[PDB]
Amino acid sequence: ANLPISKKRKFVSDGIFKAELNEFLTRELAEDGYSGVEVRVTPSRTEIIIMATKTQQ
Amino acid sequence: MGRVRTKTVKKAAKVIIEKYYTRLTLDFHTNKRICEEVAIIPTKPLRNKIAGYVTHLMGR
């Protein structure tokens, strides 16, 4: 987003990105028993880890 | 208007009969402060309900 939008929407426009993800990781990878997430928006790139019981899936 | 200290204040009220008979006296603000080291109260403001009783305990 190349838009200067302030904090009352930054914590929800990138903030609902984790809840729309949360059933997408339930639905697409349902073969593993997807447990949960941990996102961390770092500078220049973001990473999110995914915990499960079936992890070489 | 309870007219006795109502709910489950014998977590401390009957451990000070022999394990802490001394190490306190009749002053209410002293035993306000001795309760914090004898048990890990995880959310504190229960503290004075289980400290303010000694004004009624030692008088009785």
């Binding site: 929407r9 929800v12 426009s13 984790k18 809840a19 | -």
Partner: protein
Amino acid sequence: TLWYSHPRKYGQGSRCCRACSNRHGLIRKYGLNICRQCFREYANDIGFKKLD
């Protein structure tokens, strides 16, 4: 094209509910478009703990 009516940029129908495609139950006070009935359980986890 021809007969491709309703340039719908006036009134909510149909620029509405990118999440669940529910028309007459939209919520927009931060720009979400998420079917507010679904939002009652989506609020966790998007902050939104009821502190009172």
